[PDB]
Design an enzyme around this catalytic site. Structure first.
Site, PDB file in Angstrom:
ATOM      1  N   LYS A 191      28.682 -15.616  40.126  1.00 15.90           N
ATOM      2  CA  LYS A 191      29.723 -15.125  39.229  1.00 15.90           C
ATOM      3  C   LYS A 191      28.997 -14.779  37.891  1.00 15.90           C
ATOM      4  CE  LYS A 191      34.300 -15.843  37.272  1.00 15.90           C
ATOM      5  NZ  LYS A 191      35.191 -14.964  38.007  1.00 15.90           N
ATOM      6  N   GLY A 205      33.471 -10.747  40.623  1.00 18.67           N
ATOM      7  CA  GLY A 205      33.593 -10.249  39.268  1.00 18.67           C
ATOM      8  C   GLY A 205      34.564 -11.129  38.494  1.00 18.67           C
ATOM      9  N   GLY A 259      43.845 -15.178  43.590  1.00 19.92           N
ATOM     10  CA  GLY A 259      43.156 -16.129  44.453  1.00 19.92           C
ATOM     11  C   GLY A 259      41.819 -15.641  44.934  1.00 19.92           C
ATOM     12  N   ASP A 281      35.804 -21.734  38.448  1.00 18.12           N
ATOM     13  CA  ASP A 281      35.560 -20.800  39.520  1.00 18.12           C
ATOM     14  C   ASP A 281      34.105 -20.732  39.907  1.00 18.12           C
ATOM     15  OD1 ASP A 281      38.286 -20.390  39.349  1.00 18.12           O
ATOM     16  OD2 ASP A 281      38.166 -18.398  38.565  1.00 18.12           O
ATOM     17  N   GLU A 339      44.126 -13.671  38.720  1.00 16.90           N
ATOM     18  CA  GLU A 339      44.894 -14.756  39.343  1.00 16.90           C
ATOM     19  C   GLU A 339      45.635 -14.441  40.653  1.00 16.90           C
ATOM     20  OE1 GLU A 339      45.001 -18.207  37.403  1.00 16.90           O
ATOM     21  OE2 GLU A 339      43.322 -16.951  36.825  1.00 16.90           O
TER      22      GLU A 339
END
Ligand SMILES: Nc1ncnc2c1ncn2[C@@H]1O[C@H](COP(=O)(O)OP(=O)(O)CP(=O)(O)O)[C@@H](O)[C@H]1O
Ligand SMILES: Nc1ncnc2c1ncn2[C@@H]1O[C@H](COP(=O)(O)OP(=O)(O)CP(=O)(O)O)[C@@H](O)[C@H]1O
Ligand SMILES: C[C@H](N)[C@@H](CCCCCC(=O)O)NC(=O)O
Ligand SMILES: C[C@H](N)[C@@H](CCCCCC(=O)O)NC(=O)O
Lengths: 224, 224
Positions: free
Chosen positions: B37, B116, B14, B54, B12
């Site tokens: 991802k 990652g 960004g 994400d 977290e």
């Protein structure tokens, strides 16, 4: 004297709560104890000068009566990185003053805990980090891990860098910074497998004032 | 194809906002782009299966139209470490599936960004970490630093471990996770001195939905 340096996986993971627990266990074992926080930033105004709360915790958990300046030679008001406010104030943090302070404690205590500020790589000047002083002193290191999502990565990064610097990772302490959550047992099993040092104990989530709590019982000093 | 792995100083900070900025700059440069991802935990239920936000951001910032499974082969519902929920579900995260997925993207894109999950050392199984797969693939690494108190220590820990693994730290990105604070300039100067890689750009604090913001302009792709 036995000497240990305590570091954390981040700033604000409870390194001082775990240092008070360690001091309480060493006192219970019969050692003459002294806490030492050479550098502190984030301090309050008093009639005697600036006082940092973490250094005050170390001072009152020591078994010897110690003067504040002996526990904490360098005190800065602003809660930032020590190299920024040192330069700003025109007060260099000297490695020889930090080392003399450690020796002065060793004249009277046979078990000394040294607490750094922030994490492992906290800069003290533009060419010198806390890690450089700990390496110079050859202090064994105890890692405090605040158990939260992201702590596996931070515990393994810090563990590997300390071993790369040729220092002994003496142990680690699990500190429960949140209430019981869903994957606590699995996080404690992964951390135990991955950190190449003994787990010395686990401090539970203590809502009200945990540095004044009697926490010595959660540490097994036999493994140090 | 040019290939880059993006890691963060913590979970977290960004990393996905900075990955969308990087993809937007590479598209502006004329590259055929794909975000990847391989592993994602923390996903929502939809008619098509679980979808991670994400990975959805990476999919819509890619210049090629890509299917979701191509962007994100492994999707887990629970927001925890991928090795915990992989074991729990009986779905091993296979290094050969992660690598095949990268090759499949390379058939169509000439600039591929691989994101990652969490930080550098995130475990994928009890004997395998994300770091092992990146080393195996010999991907150059871009480090995203969320600028906050404690980020100097975390940026230097991650930087040193990547160089110890014999990988190239291609660059770093500063991401402003908080509003302007008092020692921002001094933190940016220390970070620039200490990280042995070019600063590729700084993304400002963007209150509302920053992964949908046009942020490509804050990245200088010339330094990569
Ligand atoms: N076991 C515990 N239960 C509840 N709260 C805890 C706790 N351990 C630590 N905390 C809280 O987390 C905060 C940080 O704790 P502490 O002061 O010991 O951290 P630290 O020594 O890492 C700070 P610094 O990085 O400035 O050196 C404090 O507000 C403290 O009360
Ligand atoms: N420049 C910025 N301005 C405002 N908020 C930002 C920001 N960059 C990141 N954030 C916020 O911080 C949170 C984490 O951002 P992001 O999703 O990109 O992180 P990350 O990729 O590191 C997550 P994970 O560790 O799960 O992979 C989000 O809620 C995001 O909106
Ligand atoms: C659940 C998180 N948000 C993240 C994975 C974090 C793993 C953290 C492991 C650790 O404790 O180091 N998921 C993801 O990137 O999809
Ligand atoms: C102000 C903090 N609370 C702490 C020092 C943190 C330094 C962080 C440096 C970094 O960004 O890595 N102070 C202290 O331990 O007295």
């Amino acid at each position: 004297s036995k000497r240990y340096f305590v570091t954390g996986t981040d700033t604000e993971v409870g390194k001082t709560v775990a240092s008070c627990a360690l001091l309480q266990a060493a006192k219970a074992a019969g050692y003459r104890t002294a806490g030492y926080k050479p550098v502190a930033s984030g301090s309050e105004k008093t009639p005697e000068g600036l006082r940092n709360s973490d250094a005050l915790a170390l001072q009152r958990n020591s078994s010897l009566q110690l003067d504040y300046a002996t526990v904490n030679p360098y005190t800065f008001a602003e809660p930032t990185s020590p190299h920024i406010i040192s330069a700003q104030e025109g007060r260099p943090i000297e490695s020889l003053v930090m080392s003399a302070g450690l020796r002065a404690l060793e004249q009277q205590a046979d078990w000394v805990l040294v607490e750094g500020a922030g994490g492992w790589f906290t800069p003290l000047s533009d060419t010198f980090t806390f890690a450089d002083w700990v390496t110079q002193e050859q202090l064994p290191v105890i890692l405090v891990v605040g158990v939260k999502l992201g702590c596996i990565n931070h515990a393994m990064l810090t563990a590997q860098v300390i071993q790369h610097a040729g220092l002994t990772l003496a142990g680690w302490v699990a500190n429960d910074v949140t209430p019981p959550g869903k994957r606590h047992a699995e996080y404690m099993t992964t951390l135990t497998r991955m950190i190449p040092a003994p787990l010395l104990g686990e401090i539970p989530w203590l809502a009200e004032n945990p540095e004044n709590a009697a926490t010595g019982k959660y540490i097994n000093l036999a493994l140090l």
